[PDB]
Amino acid sequence: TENLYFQSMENFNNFYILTSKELGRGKFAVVRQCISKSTGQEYAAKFLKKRRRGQDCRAEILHEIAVLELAKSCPRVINLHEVYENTSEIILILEYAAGGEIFSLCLPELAEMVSENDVIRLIKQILEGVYYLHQNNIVHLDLKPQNILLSSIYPLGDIKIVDFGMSRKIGHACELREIMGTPEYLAPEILNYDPITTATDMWNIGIIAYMLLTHTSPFVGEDNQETYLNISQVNVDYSEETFSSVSQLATDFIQSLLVKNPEKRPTAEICLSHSWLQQWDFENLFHPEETSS
Numbered sequence: 001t002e003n004l005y006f007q008s009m010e011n012f013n014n015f016y017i018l019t020s021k022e023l024g025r026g027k028f029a030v031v032r033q034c035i036s037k038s039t040g041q042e043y044a045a046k047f048l049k050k051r052r053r054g055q056d057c058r059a060e061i062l063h064e065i066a067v068l069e070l071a072k073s074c075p076r077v078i079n080l081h082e083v084y085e086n087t088s089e090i091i092l093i094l095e096y097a098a099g100g101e102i103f104s105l106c107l108p109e110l111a112e113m114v115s116e117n118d119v120i121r122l123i124k125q126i127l128e129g130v131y132y133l134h135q136n137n138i139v140h141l142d143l144k145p146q147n148i149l150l151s152s153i154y155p156l157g158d159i160k161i162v163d164f165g166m167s168r169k170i171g172h173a174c175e176l177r178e179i180m181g182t183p184e185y186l187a188p189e190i191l192n193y194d195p196i197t198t199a200t201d202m203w204n205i206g207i208i209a210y211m212l213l214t215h216t217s218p219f220v221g222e223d224n225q226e227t228y229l230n231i232s233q234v235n236v237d238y239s240e241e242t243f244s245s246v247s248q249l250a251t252d253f254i255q256s257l258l259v260k261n262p263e264k265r266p267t268a269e270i271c272l273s274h275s276w277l278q279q280w281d282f283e284n285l286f287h288p289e290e291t292s293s
């Protein structure tokens with residue numbers, strides 16, 4: 001039956017070799033490192049299954065590629081290089097991010113806390129990306145720490161937002177796919193079936209900052225029941241033990257985002273002006289208001 005649209009699998013295997021480094025696996029998706037045979041350049045090949053739960057999902061995948069294509073120009077978003085297709089898969093040849101997931105910097109078992117300088121930088125960069133997406137009426141809707149990557153870890157590199165499979169336009173219906181995300185990263189409005197808002201992304205940015213500063217998930221519980229209660233009650237550990245080494249300004253940033261009412265959360269643009277993220281690079285010469293004149 002189906003005619004293929006994208007570049008042939010025979011061309012894929014001619015131009016690239018897969019490496020033994022599997023990068024991620026989900027129910028309908030596998031990501032594996034590959035190398036260009038001609039240049040030696042590394043990429044991440046994302047293999048997306050077209051058939052899902054009975055459904056022909058090529059239209060969905062095409063939409064995901066449209067979104068990636070629009071957002072390509074923003075350096076905080078992962079870059080799409082090529083697309084290939086075979087009987088069962090559409091394969092995205094994406095930018096390789098050698099640092100892996102920002103989640104690795106949030107793990108309880110990591111001993112080194114990332115410096116405040118670094119957390120500030122990383123949050124700024126994530127906000128720049130989200131600002132760009134929101135300016136183009138794209139809500140990501142799955143901004144879990146596993147979907148933000150780093151270009152390197154030694155030294156600490158730059159941010160790349162990935163995985164636009166849940167992304168929608170502003171004010172689209174909160175449907176069966178939304179209410180099925182990762183339970184601990186879902187916003188209150190998602191649980192309560194309110195429509196999609198840019199504010200949902202901002203809540204997720206609150207979580208990322210909390211996780212970078214405390215190495216603890218703010219809402220996960222005993223069970224998913226307690227997770228959902230924690231989300232809907234907005235029950236967050238701000239205790240002095242957890243926050244003794246976290247600045248007030250960072251606390252303020254998180255608290256202004258982790259609020260039940262999506263309309264009270266500031267926009268990406270306003271967040272970029274937050275006092276917390278205003279930092280002078282000590283290597284630059286500051287030019288004060290009182291001039292030599």
Ligand SMILES: CN1CCN(c2ccc3[nH]c(-c4c(N)c5c(F)cccc5[nH]c4=O)nc3c2)CC1
Pocket residue numbers: 023024031043044046078094095096097098099100101149162163
């Ligand atoms: C020592 N180091 C630790 C981190 N290590 C690592 C682990 C997992 C990683 N995943 C990706 C990756 C994607 N998962 C990915 C995507 F899911 C969508 C779009 C583009 C992507 N590009 C990627 O590069 N890089 C990783 C590096 C490399 C070795």
